[PDB]
Design a protein around this ligand. Sequence first.
Ligand code: HEM
Ligand code: HEM
Ligand SMILES: [C-]#N
Ligand SMILES: [C-]#N
Ligand SMILES: [Ca+2]
Lengths: 144, 147
Amino acid sequence: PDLEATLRAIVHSATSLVDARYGAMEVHDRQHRVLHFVYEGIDEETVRRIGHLPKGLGVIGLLIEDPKPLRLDDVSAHPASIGFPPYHPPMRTFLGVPVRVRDESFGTLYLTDKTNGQPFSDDDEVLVQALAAAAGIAVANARL
Amino acid sequence: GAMDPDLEATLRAIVHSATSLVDARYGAMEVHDRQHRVLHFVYEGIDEETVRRIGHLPKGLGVIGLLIEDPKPLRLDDVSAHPASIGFPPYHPPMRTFLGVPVRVRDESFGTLYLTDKTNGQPFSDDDEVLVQALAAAAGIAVANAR
Ligand code: HEM
Ligand code: HEM
Ligand SMILES: [C-]#N
Ligand SMILES: [C-]#N
Ligand SMILES: [Ca+2]
């Protein structure tokens, strides 16, 4: 059972189901080390140009710190925003939710740039929570 | 006994999102074993009093029974008009429009996610079927991994 592939399929589904241009999932350990980073909407050449993987700083760092849903009209405007690295696609609208089970949170599922230029909806948020939950069971199952 | 609580919350959340996403009046999911024996059932859209009047849970017969045995997407304008249909039990809401999809992974199917009575009064669309398939595949990842 390839967990990386499983998490990637979840991200793929999330991006499609809520019409985001971009989607990503980070999964970390308790020491906040990056275990998995999977994504959709970004070409391999761009990925290469970005270079270093995200470390879970800024806005995602906020959700790792306090796991709960967060929608933003403009992720750059958030006080905690660290900004994009060189070569990274610019992104504006944002939806992120923990990837968890009841006992523990392991990750964050996040989507940007809904293709209609609108912020993500309440319904979008609830849907992504549901997909996140399926991911959470996968992660919990890989741990113990 | 009871479903694993994380699995149960997940499967409930999926039914809920599916029901909202495709504008269905009612939404349900059955999960069965490899012998096709129904083990768990979750649903939404039916009040507690009605559930009490209905009484017995579904056994995986009729149209859902068909989908358990031959797992693939099925849309119907009028579910009770299908040749495999067994009919609604006493006190069950009558239901017309139907969308049902298997809950599965590559090598195994565990269940069926199904929705009825789209609120616009129309049948469920191609778009509806595609999206509910995506929610069902997520349910499949969850079932396979709770296990
Ligand atoms: C395609 C899906 C992606 C999404 C939705 C996404 C989203 C974001 C967002 C919203 C930020 C800003 C956070 C802030 O301002 O605080 C950010 C920063 C960042 N991104 Fe991405 N990104 C994606 C792909 C990638 C890829 C492929 C890489 C590199 C392989 C990457 C590397 C980074 C890095 C290094 C940061 C700085 C913050 C950190 O290290 O945590 N991103 N990303
Ligand atoms: C609210 C979500 C529900 C949906 C979408 C739904 C859908 C359906 C449909 C379409 C049928 C017809 C099958 C056929 O004619 O072959 C059916 C039958 C049946 N329903 Fe439901 N129903 C729901 C709730 C319930 C509840 C809450 C109960 C019990 C408390 C129940 C008990 C039954 C039983 C016993 C049958 C006969 C077939 C069988 O045993 O599997 N249903 N349902
Ligand atoms: C992007 N992390
Ligand atoms: C009703 N099953
Ligand atoms: Ca709607």
